[PDB]
Amino acid sequence: VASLPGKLADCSSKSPEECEIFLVEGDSAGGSTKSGRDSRTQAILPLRGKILNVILNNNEIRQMITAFGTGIGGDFDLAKARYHKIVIMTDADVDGAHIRTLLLTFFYRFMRPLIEAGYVYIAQPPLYKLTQGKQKYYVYNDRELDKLKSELNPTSIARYKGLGEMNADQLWETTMNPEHRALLQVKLEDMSVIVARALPDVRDGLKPVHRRILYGLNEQGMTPDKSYKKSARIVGDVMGKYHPHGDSSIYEAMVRMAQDFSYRYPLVDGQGNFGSMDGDGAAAMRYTEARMTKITLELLRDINKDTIDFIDNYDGNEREPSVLPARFPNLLANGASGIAATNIPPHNLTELINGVLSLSKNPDISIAELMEDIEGPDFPTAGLILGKSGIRRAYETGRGSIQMRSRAVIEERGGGRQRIVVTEIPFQVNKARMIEKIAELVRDKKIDGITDLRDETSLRTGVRVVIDVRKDANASVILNNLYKQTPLQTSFGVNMIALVNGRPKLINLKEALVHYLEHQKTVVRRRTQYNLRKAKDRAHILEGLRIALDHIDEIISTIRESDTDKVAMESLQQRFKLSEKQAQAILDMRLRRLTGLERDKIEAEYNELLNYISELETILADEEVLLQLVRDELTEIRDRFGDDRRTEIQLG
Amino acid sequence: VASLPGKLADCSSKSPEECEIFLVEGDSAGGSTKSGRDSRTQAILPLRGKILNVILNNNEIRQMITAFGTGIGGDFDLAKARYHKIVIMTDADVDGAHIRTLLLTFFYRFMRPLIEAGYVYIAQPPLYKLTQGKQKYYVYNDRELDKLKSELNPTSIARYKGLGEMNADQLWETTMNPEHRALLQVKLEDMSVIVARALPDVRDGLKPVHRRILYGLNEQGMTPDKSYKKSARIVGDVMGKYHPHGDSSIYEAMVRMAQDFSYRYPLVDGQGNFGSMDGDGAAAMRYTEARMTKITLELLRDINKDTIDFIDNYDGNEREPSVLPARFPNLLANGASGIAATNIPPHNLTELINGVLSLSKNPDISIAELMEDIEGPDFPTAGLILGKSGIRRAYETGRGSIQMRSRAVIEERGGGRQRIVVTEIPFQVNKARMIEKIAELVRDKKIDGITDLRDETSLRTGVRVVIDVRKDANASVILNNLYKQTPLQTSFGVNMIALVNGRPKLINLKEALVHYLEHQKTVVRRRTQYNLRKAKDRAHILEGLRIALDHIDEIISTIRESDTDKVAMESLQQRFKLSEKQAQAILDMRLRRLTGLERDKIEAEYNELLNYISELETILADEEVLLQLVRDELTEIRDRFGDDRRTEIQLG
């Protein structure tokens, strides 16, 4: 029969009219769909999702076809075989509508009249569960959520994202039960978190995996001045608190911020094997060790002085930075790439910072004068850029291809023979892979005069790729031909996209720098506001302890007579006119605070503290004094972390 | 030439005598070996390890051969081609000597005289790094460690386990540098953590992944009475603190303690999709939720009252239980299996506990009377066991195969036709996989009379596998034949191995129960000792506050005059004859403790506390009273968690 024994979940009823078949993603909801359903009349085909990747008749699709009845133009019949309803059931997120599109598109091609008869439904899982206690809620779209929330008689906001979040009987009751359910008929043919979780933030130049990694290292106090911890310690922390995906994705990101050759200003300081340019992998996370770099402390300075807004983590049990204070221009400094739609090259910290300071002095500076500071990108991997034309367009429109060329010299080697010697290569270029191509060319006859080819590259000798040229051969020519047909020259395709005000923008150089400096103003100002506010609160406490201490006799006295902590309280406010807070601070004071030299510690603290409040108001009172702060602090970062440029930009 | 461009790391020197080649595992140490080495004379072949799994000429081996020179009997020459030394370099652990064996064994087969000439060396990485500060240590075997430690003039114990733990220049200096290095020549042909990390502990019946999972849930306060948390939260915690391996291994274990059908007494209470009997997987860990079960609290009760020894986690930054107090017989209750060498079936909590209590009353009870309580295994999945012969041997020797048979009935279905109806199946049996086999038999002609076959199994209807038999056919026969040739009957192979006193033992029933009850005695006694010791300490403090409070006037007085916290201290011990601890408790007392009704809270606390100390000594004073405790507490667990037996053991 049409049964697929062991891949289909068969139903007892035999007339199609009655029967329905759910196409659900295996790992997603398979088991749970199979238990919750009504096996009198409901069938389940849990589809392998990884075989349904990017012919179209694959072992899985073959099952869909043999399960229904029908076929194509060869045996078409809708009046053939079972399931008068086919219900597509997939997750809300990226990999779950990816399948929904693929299942629809297919149907449209081979099973045209399944839609014409309208046997195909999409399922409608709940969308929100709202909480207080014994009063949780199932809602199915946003407009229903305004409705039921604005209603709640005595007065937790959780978005359903995957079907596996749901128990069976809940899947039954909400999504499949002919009674409560509510599906959807299909009629027409075949974006957010994909982007959110992909582009950097213009402000601290990080993507979510990175921010959370760096945040976690901070939250764990893995500072540069304390010993290494095994990477598994960072990865697990991040995985469980902020990034609920494979460790593999997290570790990879962390590894990469730790590579001298990937990052112009490495964010993680790792010990052990972190892979290579040839693309060797890092060793097991339980083996390599890692901590913050000194420079990263700068990415995180002041994060606790209320300078960035924190947001809920993915389950609402933690809090994470929507951004980092990032007190050096990280987006531009270490750049951003990845796999897919942004591409921004690295740059000199010195250059950048000056480039910032020169804006902070004149708001309407054009890329022109900005470029007098920022000559161009500067790669960790060094090497040569070809002109200022690629750079200029990329700084002006935010798009331009830069030509990177390796560093190569021609050396003699006696007996009239010659040698090509590659000291450094272009950024992101897999060296191994290039070596294998140069060699391939030799094999085929596509290039002529290579007698040998060695990758001597080692720590103590840096990059050394060595090409031996025969006697009967010019090397200077062979060299240009290598550029022409090997990664030895590679273009960098500039595409300065990034998150501005939440949404993705394509920024130019200047715009990138402007958005950064405004975030430093924001950050130093918010800091100042926090320090002030934290200082006043403490001084209001000190006001209170002084009063308390000067009159301890009396203080103890009223307390001793007072029956409960509560009457004590009000009895302190009436008698010493202390505020609620001072009264409580007093009550919570410990007898050890009564010793001789402590009273003075207190006066001396209040006295300096009053001055602190002073100079803080002095900053907030005047915006120029506050901007000088931003310049000063940035100048210092520059002096302590600025380095020589590594990449030569030549001209003609 | 013999160069492998892009897979070999070529060396500049050309005479073999000089040259050496390191065979190192890619992901393990590849990148780091390649940087640290001396590329004048050292070559690196980083081998793919997953292709070197369990022909023997594979793409990787082909490289080894083409890299050296030589071959087999076809072109043999040791005087051919480069590398007069081949250095095998692999990890210390399981997957790293696995490769070392495979590389040796191979050599022995195809490259016999490589060893005869002794070109093959094994490398000797350091083994320990000892710490204090600027004084860390590289040692190469245990005997050197006694030597250098027992020596240290002013007076951290870390075992090196993977090469990726090491930086390049360290790998260079310690392991590869002709100078310091020190290798090994090979001459002869081709166990601990594999076991440690595999068998349960007889005591709480857990393996390491499980204990750490359960421990973590406790350390995170994920109790039954607080809401679910996404599994990613447990997995990440465990991964980073205690189990530095893939999340995948951890999640799988956690998922399994949450399945009604896998665990007779589920340890995790999950919400969402946790897979099925047909072997559907759980949904993404960021989607499913989980917490402790009520029963698991029992596995963890008293863990903080110093009842088990804690040990360092894998990096020495955390502490974990070497065992759990486990106040119900978990090993035997939920059993232990896995993939590879132990196999113990589940059992009735009621039975077990009685079975324990009956021992706790007579030490020399034989399996005989023990079995009057514990009739046999009891599977979550229910069904039928075939006799007491399988059970008896397994309880006596610790080995015996038990015959599990599904629950099947034959029902009429009118018009003279019949039906086989499978309500429950044998334990661990993949239902889907069985369905696919029963069907396969029908396809081939190997079995006769099946007209249909359905897996109606659903939540609301439990297991329902339905086999339709034709008119011209006997079903009672067809049924026996199904047992004969399908998982419908499956044997359970009993093999009661477990960790006793650290090392693995094969225990029998009685021995298993004895070791448990002794651990409960240990656990209730240690608890009692902790309560006592914690009670005395607090009473010694209360002794002090009373003195302090009765004379507050004087107390405040001496404190007020005393110049520093230190003189305050000694001035309190001289004047009120308080002990160091009482003096400090006093100094740390807060003024709010001086109110009216607080003095009495203190007297009343001391007074009940004195009684507590009383009854605690009363327990430790007499071992029978302490054993009754163990019986009482176990009786209660039994009453609140005991359930009806699910699996029928028939006889003849």
Tab-separated table of C-alpha atoms in Angstrom, chain A residues 13-143:
chain	number	residue	atom	x	y	z
A	13	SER	CA	-9.109	5.575	9.153
A	14	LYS	CA	-9.004	4.637	5.480
A	15	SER	CA	-11.155	7.130	3.560
A	16	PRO	CA	-9.157	10.149	2.289
A	17	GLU	CA	-11.943	12.695	2.987
A	18	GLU	CA	-11.408	12.125	6.729
A	19	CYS	CA	-7.585	11.910	6.638
A	20	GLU	CA	-4.844	14.534	6.995
A	21	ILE	CA	-1.049	14.338	6.728
A	22	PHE	CA	1.409	16.584	8.484
A	23	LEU	CA	4.743	17.375	6.893
A	24	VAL	CA	6.839	18.382	9.889
A	25	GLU	CA	10.589	18.829	10.312
A	26	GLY	CA	12.160	15.774	12.017
A	27	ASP	CA	14.565	17.234	14.635
A	28	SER	CA	12.135	20.144	14.983
A	29	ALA	CA	8.839	18.531	15.907
A	30	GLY	CA	8.740	14.996	14.599
A	31	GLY	CA	8.502	13.041	17.815
A	32	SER	CA	6.176	15.574	19.414
A	33	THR	CA	3.863	15.706	16.329
A	34	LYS	CA	3.725	11.908	16.317
A	35	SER	CA	2.610	11.649	19.959
A	36	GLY	CA	0.167	14.475	20.114
A	37	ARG	CA	-1.801	13.535	17.003
A	38	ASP	CA	-5.052	11.645	16.505
A	39	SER	CA	-3.888	8.398	14.927
A	40	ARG	CA	-7.429	7.483	13.992
A	41	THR	CA	-7.175	10.112	11.212
A	42	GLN	CA	-3.852	11.940	11.323
A	43	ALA	CA	-0.620	10.915	9.545
A	44	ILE	CA	2.927	12.312	10.060
A	45	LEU	CA	5.793	12.434	7.591
A	46	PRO	CA	8.777	13.817	9.531
A	47	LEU	CA	11.138	15.105	6.859
A	48	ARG	CA	14.924	15.076	7.094
A	49	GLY	CA	15.841	18.781	6.925
A	50	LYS	CA	19.534	18.568	5.995
A	51	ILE	CA	18.768	16.431	2.935
A	52	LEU	CA	16.208	19.067	2.025
A	53	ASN	CA	19.089	21.594	1.570
A	54	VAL	CA	19.790	23.625	-1.634
A	55	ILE	CA	17.441	17.238	-9.621
A	56	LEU	CA	14.637	17.795	-7.107
A	57	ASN	CA	13.537	14.159	-6.703
A	58	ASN	CA	15.573	13.248	-3.539
A	59	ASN	CA	14.980	10.207	-1.252
A	60	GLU	CA	12.821	12.418	1.046
A	61	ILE	CA	10.723	13.951	-1.755
A	62	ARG	CA	10.284	10.454	-3.151
A	63	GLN	CA	8.587	9.646	0.138
A	64	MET	CA	6.233	12.668	-0.041
A	65	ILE	CA	5.164	11.526	-3.491
A	66	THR	CA	4.678	7.831	-2.568
A	67	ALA	CA	2.805	8.852	0.585
A	68	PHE	CA	0.143	10.957	-1.096
A	69	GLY	CA	-0.870	9.005	-4.223
A	70	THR	CA	-0.716	10.914	-7.530
A	71	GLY	CA	2.678	11.653	-9.270
A	72	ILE	CA	2.958	14.188	-12.150
A	73	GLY	CA	1.628	14.135	-15.716
A	74	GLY	CA	2.329	10.429	-15.460
A	75	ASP	CA	-0.584	9.376	-13.195
A	76	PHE	CA	-2.028	12.723	-12.018
A	77	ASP	CA	-5.302	11.876	-10.222
A	78	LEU	CA	-6.288	13.984	-7.182
A	79	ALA	CA	-9.078	11.423	-6.843
A	80	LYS	CA	-6.282	8.926	-6.176
A	81	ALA	CA	-5.093	7.776	-2.774
A	82	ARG	CA	-5.216	9.324	0.659
A	83	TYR	CA	-4.862	12.527	2.672
A	84	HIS	CA	-7.460	15.093	1.474
A	85	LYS	CA	-5.380	17.544	3.565
A	86	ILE	CA	-1.589	18.052	3.605
A	87	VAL	CA	-0.429	20.292	6.419
A	88	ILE	CA	2.972	21.937	6.208
A	89	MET	CA	4.298	22.394	9.718
A	90	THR	CA	7.650	24.205	10.237
A	91	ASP	CA	9.424	26.519	12.690
A	92	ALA	CA	8.982	30.319	12.753
A	93	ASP	CA	12.722	31.079	12.357
A	94	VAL	CA	15.205	31.039	9.433
A	95	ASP	CA	15.807	27.307	8.871
A	96	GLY	CA	12.043	26.591	9.294
A	97	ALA	CA	10.565	28.862	6.632
A	98	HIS	CA	13.482	27.892	4.385
A	99	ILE	CA	11.833	24.445	4.339
A	100	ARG	CA	8.301	25.938	4.000
A	101	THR	CA	9.387	27.816	0.843
A	102	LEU	CA	11.023	24.602	-0.498
A	103	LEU	CA	7.941	22.521	0.172
A	104	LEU	CA	5.648	25.111	-1.453
A	105	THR	CA	7.903	25.738	-4.507
A	106	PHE	CA	8.094	21.956	-5.093
A	107	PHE	CA	4.332	21.488	-4.853
A	108	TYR	CA	3.873	24.284	-7.417
A	109	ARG	CA	6.165	22.417	-9.877
A	110	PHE	CA	5.232	18.698	-9.715
A	111	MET	CA	1.938	18.761	-7.820
A	112	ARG	CA	0.254	21.816	-9.401
A	113	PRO	CA	-3.416	20.844	-8.651
A	114	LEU	CA	-2.806	19.941	-5.009
A	115	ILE	CA	-3.092	23.713	-4.533
A	116	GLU	CA	-5.938	24.035	-7.090
A	117	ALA	CA	-7.968	21.568	-5.020
A	118	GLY	CA	-6.530	23.263	-1.922
A	119	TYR	CA	-5.474	20.127	-0.076
A	120	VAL	CA	-2.313	21.975	1.148
A	121	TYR	CA	-2.542	23.892	4.403
A	122	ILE	CA	0.086	25.734	6.373
A	123	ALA	CA	-0.271	25.243	10.171
A	124	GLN	CA	-0.673	28.078	12.650
A	125	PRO	CA	1.126	27.432	15.937
A	126	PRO	CA	0.509	29.933	18.799
A	127	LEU	CA	2.809	32.925	18.719
A	128	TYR	CA	2.965	34.269	22.245
A	129	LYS	CA	2.668	32.885	25.713
A	130	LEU	CA	1.924	35.558	28.363
A	131	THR	CA	2.366	34.899	32.077
A	132	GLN	CA	1.515	35.942	35.589
A	133	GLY	CA	0.979	32.569	37.291
A	134	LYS	CA	-1.858	30.043	36.906
A	135	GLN	CA	-2.882	32.459	34.141
A	136	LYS	CA	-0.732	31.808	31.044
A	137	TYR	CA	-1.868	32.644	27.478
A	138	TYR	CA	-2.026	31.262	23.895
A	139	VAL	CA	-2.275	33.965	21.214
A	140	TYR	CA	-1.759	33.608	17.462
A	141	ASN	CA	-0.771	37.087	16.069
A	142	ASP	CA	0.289	40.547	17.305
A	143	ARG	CA	-3.151	42.166	17.071
